[PDB]
Amino acid sequence: DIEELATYINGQTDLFKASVDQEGKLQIFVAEPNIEGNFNISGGLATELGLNGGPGVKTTVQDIDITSVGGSQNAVGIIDAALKYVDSQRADLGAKQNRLSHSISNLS
Amino acid sequence: PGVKTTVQDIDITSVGGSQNAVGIIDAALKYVDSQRADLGAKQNRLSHSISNLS
Amino acid sequence: QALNEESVALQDELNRIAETTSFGGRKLLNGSFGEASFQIGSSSGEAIIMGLTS
Amino acid sequence: AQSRGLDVAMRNANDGISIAQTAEGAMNESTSILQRMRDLALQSANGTNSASERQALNEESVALQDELNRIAETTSFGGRKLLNGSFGEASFQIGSSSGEAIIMGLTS
C-alpha cells in the first residue's frame, strides 16, 4: 500500500523523506543541500501515482503547518533538514574555535 | 440482482422472515468477527512494534 | 409480534452502538472514521494504516 | 600519537559494538515474529478449520509479514539503515596504525 511504499522509499535512500498525507498522496521531500535544479522523476510507477517532479514547492521552517496529517509528515522532513543544517553550522563554529585555540597557544 | 436484505431490513412477523433472518444474522456475525480478527492482528502488530521500538 | 418488537429494539441498540462508541469525541464505528495512519516510526513515513468499517 | 590512536580505536570498537547490539535486538524481535507466524501456520494446518478461520489466520499472518518488512526497513542507527539490505560489508578501525579493521556485514 501507499504507506509501505513510502517506508520503502525512505529506507532505500537518505536524500528523500517520503511521506503520506491524509488522502494518501505521496509527499517526497528533498532537503535543501541535496537538490539544485529541476528534480525530475520518471518510471511507470510515478505515472501510476501521477507524480510530477519539477522545480518543487519551496518550504522552510517558517512555512510549517501541522493541522493536517500531510502537514506533519512534511514537517518531519523539514525539521530533519533544518537540524542537519544547524548541526553543520555548529560543527563549523567548533572547528573555528579549535583553530583559534591552537593559534592562540602558538602565538603565546 | 436479488432483493437486498441487511440486518436493519430484518422482520420476523412471518416464518420466511425468520428463516431469512437466521442467514442474514449469520452473515453479519461473520463480517463482525472478521473485522474483530483484523483489529486483533493490528493490536498484535502494534505490540510487537512497541517492543521493538523500546 | 413480541419477538419482532424485541428484535427491532435490538436493531436500535445496534445503531446506537454504531453511532455512539467514541474515543474522546472521535467516532469509531459509524464509518466516518474512514482509515487513519498511526506513525509508529521515528522518521517520515514509517506509519501503519488502520481500517475501521461502519 | 599511538595513545590517541588507541583512544580512537576504542571509540570505533565501541561504535561497532553498539551497531551490532541494535541489529541483534531487531533480529530478536524478528525471530519472535517468525515464531508467532510458525504457530499461526501450524494452527491453520489442523483439519477442523473450515475456511473462515483460515482467512483470519491469513490476515494475522499478512499483518505479521508487513511487520517483518517494516522492521527490516525501519530499524536504524541514527539514520543508517541496518537490516534493509544497504549496510553491506563495512569496516571498523580498531587499531592504532593503518591496516586494522573488522569487517561486519548485515544481510537484509
Curated annotation (Swiss-Prot), chain A:
Compartments where located: Secreted; Bacterial flagellum
State where it is primarily located: secreted
Assigned GO CC terms? bacterial-type flagellum; extracellular region
Q: What keywords would UniProt list here?
A: Bacterial flagellum, Coiled coil, Secreted, Virulence
Among its keywords, does the record have Acetylation? no
Assembly description: Heteromer of multiple flagellin subunits including FlaA, FlaB, FlaC, FlaD and FlaE.
Remarks, miscellaneous:
V.cholerae is able to differentially regulate the flagellins within the flagellum maybe to produce flagella which are particularly suited for motility within a given environment. A flagellar filament composed exclusively of FlaA is fragile and easily broken.
Function, in words: Flagellin is the subunit protein which polymerizes to form the filaments of bacterial flagella. FlaA is required to form a core or scaffold into which the other flagellins are inserted to provide structural integrity. Essential for flagellar synthesis and motility; important for full virulence.
- Family per UniProt? Belongs to the bacterial flagellin family.
The protein's name: Flagellin A
Q: What organism, scientifically named, is this protein from? A: Vibrio cholerae serotype O1 (strain ATCC 39315 / El Tor Inaba N16961)
Per the record, the gene is: flaA
- Part of the intact protein present: 218 to 325 of 379
From Swiss-Prot, chain C:
Q: Which residues form a coiled coil?
A: 1-20
The signal peptide annotation in the UniProt record is none
Q: Which domain of life is it from?
A: Bacteria
Q: Where in the cell is it found?
A: Secreted; Bacterial flagellum
Q: What does this protein do?
A: Flagellin is the subunit protein which polymerizes to form the filaments of bacterial flagella. FlaA is required to form a core or scaffold into which the other flagellins are inserted to provide structural integrity. Essential for flagellar synthesis and motility; important for full virulence.
The extra comment attached to this record reads: V.cholerae is able to differentially regulate the flagellins within the flagellum maybe to produce flagella which are particularly suited for motility within a given environment. A flagellar filament composed exclusively of FlaA is fragile and easily broken.
The family note in this entry says:
Belongs to the bacterial flagellin family.
Q: How does it assemble?
A: Heteromer of multiple flagellin subunits including FlaA, FlaB, FlaC, FlaD and FlaE.
Name of the molecule in the record: Flagellin A
Which residues of the parent chain are present? 110 to 163 of 379
